[PDB]
DNA sequence: CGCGCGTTAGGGTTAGGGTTAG
DNA sequence: CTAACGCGCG
């Protein structure tokens, strides 16, 4: 019946509506724009080495493409191609649909989407396979995904972790206690709050004495951090590590501060990962096999 | 009337990547 | 993709 046509990225013409395949070179996770809709920016590339920046809006958070890391594969349906500031641009059209897939080779091809129904043929399977192979042979694995035991000060990195606590601070910032099974090379800093709003298992937090790190998010991230469920697994993008000379108790001690600065550049944000994700499986293996006395 | 299935029509701003800090 | 839309049935 329905046979969707997929336009190569080097053949895109402005003023049309197309369906596309691509690999994610960069993406901003969905964030509240100054309008009424969540916004998501996604730069994709295909075999033609031509890049396309897509600008997607939706009132439903899950309707936007479910992207978890660079190298993921995406398929877009009903994307409008236009020209903004003498540059080609992709934007949301009426009835926009999205499928996403893991980029790792050999992994099962499992569509991630919010659409109730979607079209998927064997040719889609083969195209996802081909894009996976092309991304393996033409892109690089992300060096920004580090475990806590590998981080260095003054550094931006992406963290796959589990959340253990939340707390209010000053309104402009919000506290998140997280862990990933590994101990940082330097003990984490400890943000102080007069009246603690520690939503979480206090005994379980303290038992993990130094595997827990404090993360202070700011501005637009605050709202998102307020809506997170304790125990869920998170990916925090472009977290910033700094070194510190004296702690919150005004003692002399070198500590690692983790900040999630305001704005959305370099993908700074948070995304909740489902337990069906394989990185979450490895994270579970690390959380269970953690050194603690 | 109530279903129901086939057809296809469609409100247009949000932000349009690129790390000051706190 | 999804649900408003309209003609054709029970």
SS3 string, chain A, reads CCCCCECCHHHCCCCEEEEEEEEEEEECCCEECCCCCEEEEEEEECCCCCEEEEEEEECCHHHCCCCCCCCCEEEEEEEEEEEECCEEEEEEEEEEEEEEECCCCCCCCCCECCCCCCCCCHHHHHHHHHHHHHHHHHCCCCCCECCHHHCCCCEEEEEEEEEEEEEECCCCEEEEEEECCCCCCCCECCCCCCCCCCECCHHHHHHCCCCCEEEEEECHHHHHHHCCCCCCEEEEEEEEEEEEEECCCCCEEEEEEEEECCCCHHHCEEEEECCCCHHHHHHHHHHHCCCCC
Distance in angstroms: CA A144, C1' C6: 55
Q: Which numeric CATH code is attached to A16-137?
A: 2.40.50.140
Please state the length of chain A.
293
For A206, residues 6+ apart whose C-beta sits below 8 A from its C-beta are: none
> What's the angle, vertex CA A100, arms to CA A94 and CA A103, rounded to 5?
150
Whether any strand C atom is under 7 angstroms from the Cβ of A93: the reply reads: no
Whether any strand C atom is under 7 angstroms from the Cβ of A6: the reply reads: no
Distance in angstroms: CA A66, C1' B2: 40
Q: What is the 3-class SS of A144-159, one letter each residue?
A: CECCHHHCCCCEEEEE
The CA distance from A178 to A59, in Å, is 29
Technique of determination: X-ray
Whether any strand B atom is under 7 angstroms from the Cβ of A61: the reply reads: no
Q: Are A91 and A55 in contact (CB under 8 A)?
A: yes
Identical fold between A16-137 and A148-288: yes
Whether any strand C atom is under 7 angstroms from the Cβ of A190: the reply reads: no
Could you tell me the resolution of this structure in angstroms? 2.6
**Rounded to whole angstroms, what are the CA distances from A198 to A40, A169, A247?**
31, 11, 20
Distance in angstroms: CA A87, C1' C4: 35
The CA distance from A261 to A269, in Å, is 9
The domain spans of chain A are 16-137, 148-288
In the complex, which nucleotide's C1' lies nearest to the CA atom of residue A42? B17
Whether any strand C atom is under 7 angstroms from the Cβ of A213: the reply reads: no
Whether any strand C atom is under 7 angstroms from the Cβ of A117: the reply reads: yes
Nearest protein residue by Cα to C1' of nucleotide B14 = A35
Q: Are A252 and A245 in contact (CB under 8 A)?
A: yes
Whether any strand C atom is under 7 angstroms from the Cβ of A97: the reply reads: yes
Q: Quick count: other Cβ atoms within 10 Å of Cβ A209?
A: 11
Q: Which numeric CATH code is attached to A148-288?
A: 2.40.50.140
Q: Are A4 and A58 in contact (CB under 8 A)?
A: no
For A11, residues 6+ apart whose C-beta sits below 8 A from its C-beta are: none
In the complex, which nucleotide's C1' lies nearest to the CA atom of residue A96? C1
Distance in angstroms: CA A92, C1' C7: 32
> What's the angle, vertex CA A78, arms to CA A72 and CA A82, rounded to 5?
95
Whether any strand C atom is under 7 angstroms from the Cβ of A118: the reply reads: yes
Whether any strand C atom is under 7 angstroms from the Cβ of A2: the reply reads: yes
Integer-rounded Cα Rg, in Å, for chain A is 21
Nearest to A29 by CA among A273, A280, A282: A273
Give residue for tokens 């509240």.
A32
Q: Quick count: other Cβ atoms within 10 Å of Cβ A126?
A: 11
The number of C-alpha atoms within 13 Å of A270 and in the hemisphere containing its C-beta is: 28
In the complex, which nucleotide's C1' lies nearest to the CA atom of residue A19? C1
The number of C-alpha atoms within 13 Å of A225 and in the hemisphere containing its C-beta is: 32
Nearest to A124 by CA among A145, A93, A99: A99
The CA distance from A169 to A26, in Å, is 31
Whether any strand B atom is under 7 angstroms from the Cβ of A263: the reply reads: yes
Q: Are A283 and A180 in contact (CB under 8 A)?
A: yes
Whether any strand B atom is under 7 angstroms from the Cβ of A265: the reply reads: yes
Q: Are A203 and A242 in contact (CB under 8 A)?
A: no
Max distance between CA atoms of chain A, in angstroms, equals 71
The number of C-alpha atoms within 13 Å of A99 and in the hemisphere containing its C-beta is: 19
Give residue for tokens 């580090």.
A146
Distance in angstroms: CA A52, C1' C10: 52
For A79, residues 6+ apart whose C-beta sits below 8 A from its C-beta are: A17, A18, A19, A20, A54, A90, A91, A92, A93, A96
Q: Are A51 and A45 in contact (CB under 8 A)?
A: yes
A176 token code pair: 């998140």
The CA distance from A236 to A159, in Å, is 5
């Amino acid at each position: 019946a329905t046979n969707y046509i997929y336009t190569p990225l080097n053949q895109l013409k402005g003023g049309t509506i197309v369906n596309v395949y691509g690999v994610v070179k960069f993406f901003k996770p969905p964030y509240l724009s100054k309008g009424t809709d969540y916004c998501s920016v996604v730069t994709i590339v295909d075999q033609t080495n031509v890049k396309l920046t897509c600008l997607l809006f939706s009132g439903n958070y899950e309707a936007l493409p479910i992207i978890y890391k660079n190298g993921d594969i995406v398929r877009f349906h009903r994307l409008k191609i236009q020209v903004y500031k003498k540059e080609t641009q992709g934007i949301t059209s009426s009835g926009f649909a999205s499928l996403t897939f893991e980029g790792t080779l050999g992994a099962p091809i499992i569509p991630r989407t919010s659409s109730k129904y979607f079209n998927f043929t064997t040719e889609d399977h083969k195209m996802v396979e081909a894009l996976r192979v092309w991304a393996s042979t033409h892109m690089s694995p992300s060096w920004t995904l580090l475990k806590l035991c590998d981080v260095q000060p003054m550094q931006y990195f992406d963290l796959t972790c589990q959340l253990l606590g939340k707390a209010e601070v000053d309104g402009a910032s919000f506290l998140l206690k997280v862990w990933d099974g590994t101990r940082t090379p330097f003990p984490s800093w400890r943000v102080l709050i007069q009246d603690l709003v520690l939503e979480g298992d206090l005994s379980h937090i303290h038992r993990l004495q130094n595997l827990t790190i404090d993360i202070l998010v700011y501005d637009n991230h605050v709202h998102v951090a307020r809506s997170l469920k304790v125990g869920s697994f998170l990916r925090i993008y472009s977290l910033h590590t700094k070194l510190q000379s004296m702690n919150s108790e005004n003692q002399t001690m070198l500590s690692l501060e983790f900040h999630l600065h305001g704005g959305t550049s370099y993908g700074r944000g948070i995304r909740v990962l489902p337990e069906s994700n394989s990185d979450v499986d490895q994270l579970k293996k690390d959380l269970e096999s953690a050194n603690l006395t």
